[PDB]
Design a binder for this molecule. Sequence first.
Ligand code: ZN
Lengths: 245, 98, 302, 145, 107
Amino acid sequence: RYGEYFTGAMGAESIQKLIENFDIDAEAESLRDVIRNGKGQKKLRALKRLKVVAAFQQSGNSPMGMVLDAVPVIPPELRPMVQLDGGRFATSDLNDLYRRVINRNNRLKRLIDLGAPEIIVNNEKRMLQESVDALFDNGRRGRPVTGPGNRPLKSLSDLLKGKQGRFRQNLLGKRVDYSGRSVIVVGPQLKLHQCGLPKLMALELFKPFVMKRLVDLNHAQNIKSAKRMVERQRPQVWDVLEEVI
Amino acid sequence: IHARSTGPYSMITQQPLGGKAQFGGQRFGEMECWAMQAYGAAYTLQELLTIKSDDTVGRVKVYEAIVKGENIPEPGIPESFKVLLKELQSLCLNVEVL
Amino acid sequence: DSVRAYLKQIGKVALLNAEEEVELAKRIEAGLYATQLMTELSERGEKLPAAQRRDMMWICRDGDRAKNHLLEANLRLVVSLAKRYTGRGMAFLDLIQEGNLGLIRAVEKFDYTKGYKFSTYATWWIRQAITRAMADQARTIRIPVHMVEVINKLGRIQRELLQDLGREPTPEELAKEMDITPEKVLEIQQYAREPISLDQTIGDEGDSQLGDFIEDSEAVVAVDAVSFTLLQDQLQSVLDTLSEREAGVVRLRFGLTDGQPRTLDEIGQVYGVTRERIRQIESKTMSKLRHPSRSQVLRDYL
Amino acid sequence: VNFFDELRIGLATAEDIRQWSYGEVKKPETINYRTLKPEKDGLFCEKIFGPTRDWECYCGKYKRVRFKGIICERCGVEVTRAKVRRERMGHIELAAPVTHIWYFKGVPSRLGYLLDLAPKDLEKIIYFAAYVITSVDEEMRHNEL
Amino acid sequence: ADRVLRGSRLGAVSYETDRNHDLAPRQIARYRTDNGEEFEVPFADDAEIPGTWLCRNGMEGTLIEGDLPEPKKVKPPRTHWDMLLERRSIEELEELLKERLELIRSR
DNA sequence: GCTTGACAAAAGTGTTAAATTGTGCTATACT
DNA sequence: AGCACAATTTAACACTTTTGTCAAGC
Ligand SMILES: [Zn+2]
């Protein structure tokens, strides 16, 4: 009764519709006017709102980007699945979130086909919304999805946040190759630009260089024989190491 | 006394890794990076950060050069930067290099 | 929490009694029959009088209305039955939705002439659908239904056996018990276990994860990568010292340059010879290579 | 390219997300349980993400390096370096719209200002707890009044 | 258990050398989806080109040529009418259609 | 240097049986 | 659970052609 005159909706589709019938320039002009004349706790709100309104208006953005209609899926090797000896699979947790999303999406897609009471389709769409929310940022809205052990699964955002994310990666330091360590003593006969170095550690650090430099002088048939000779500590190497150090 | 030229690497994170009969690899921490920067030595820092810890296509490409006696390829942009873009785009964030 | 909003929403619906669904089923079938007759009228054309069509279309609408009414009336039974399948493999709402699908199936496959309580027949479907779900969508690595049956059977058998014996049974024991060989029961046991999560901290403080301790058993050794190219080049050098033909003969035989081997006659196809004229040359060239001078440079790459 | 000047961020329109993928996934399957190989059309799929074995298709009609850049007409799996399973993305075509949470459940809720709705009133709408008016035909609602 | 437990990947790695010359020749086809899309797909030179292709878009597309071999073999999905026809005889339904009809005709 | 002849082991090729996997179904009442 | 049945994939076996082999000779 009276429906033919207006239109109503619910959920993300309703919000997308609202954003479609949204004129940004008019809202920006209206906020300009409100900040021009008004004052008190009516120009602070106006100015705040105008902040994001202008953020959307200036650049070549579009509010349509805030309502998803196609969800990307990260490459497989960024959520690996590796088989620990004994035939035991170990994987990330994003697999379960993607599986929940896809299952609920397919279930809604099938349920729409048959056609069913609105009471069910709405619950299904709400479940799908909550699944996507748990995917992008777990624990934000509601109680976080948890796996065996009643622990929260690491969502996509956890790839960037915390001291484990990509941003905080190169800052926390990382162990490197061609390195060693040892106890120190005094070298009172060394010059200011020299230092002692145990021949074993020198022969381990410089293994590739000596491996090469003992191929020119035909002390080994090929790089493989050279590597074997070096790992065996043959007498020939000690002459080359002094030339490469 | 320890040392490591090239040993085993962890599978999940490609940083070096050792055990009983494995070298292990030394840890170039943070204050060491601060000192390196205080020297202004950019190439040494990047080398300690890229072709010695994670960049799998860099470690082998430098080992081959060394063993063949060619020049060590100039450190470019690591491959650990074409993964941040994907991890972002997985959030519907369109980041473009200008 | 949405489980509460859903319970609230379902509550508002009014339950049904003995004979109400008796009438709803009649209305459903009448609407279906009128819809079917629709096509008969479409082909036979002759759109009946305004009322002759309007009344039938209203009866059809009544069909869908009654169907939705029954679905809403039984949603509560669905939830009541599905509220005791939780804690293992699936979320409460997914079970509720699978039960709703099962109830739709039941209502589609219900009969009102047999004179039975609707719930009695609906329970079968509402339980089967939930079980098939828990079987299909409960494991990261999917396992077909027939295997899940044997897995659950073996789980229950092992539970009962440990209860009676009061201790952990043995594989061969159940194999003798479950009418299968010990190898088959060990295989099913293998399939039983679920993948290990790769995130939780490793049992203590607390920053390192289970990931940084996995050493690949097939890692890409750099020395081998460098060695392969040198091996190719050394093969090329060694084969460049033989006859003009024998080099290409051996190559096409082992498929070095092109990449695909060739049969004995296939190579001679371009050399105008037959099986023997090719095989003799190939063998003699192999004997040539076996010479110490040739194998001195290659023996190490092996 | 080794020449950077900036690094710009922006929202991804729904028309881009489907312009990055190499296929749409439609089965929540990771790998077969007995043969340990990626399923078809599911996660880990080899036709939409890449080959699991260097220069090898799924069926196995092309194995060596001689076949690069070509696509097996049986399993549609392009043959190339197995390191492309670390650069290809897929997508999922949702059966109904879904709002990015970073902008609704934040502080301040970006939509709350873009649309001027109370956050506790927007949550009711986007979680199917209340209806919302999306358009009114003032013309007819005026004359037909 | 913090230790060195060795696992393994799924796949394989070959130390073969990339080469951009002397590779098998290929042939390109141009399939097209239902919503007017153009997708180019390579194929082996000596390969049986297929008739339909699950395109990058996500929906099956036909070729650029005019083969149009067969849109057939489809099987209609078991609907509610088939399930009613199973457990019911037309006559009964017909009779029912009459009775309820009267109720609406007689209000 | 090169062919013919017989000749045997290997690989297709086609067919048929086994197992494998997916789908439908079960009617006291239970909300 | 459990069963009943259909569709699909894997294996097993006969058989025929191909591919490698040796003896001989010219
Ligand atoms: Zn293939």
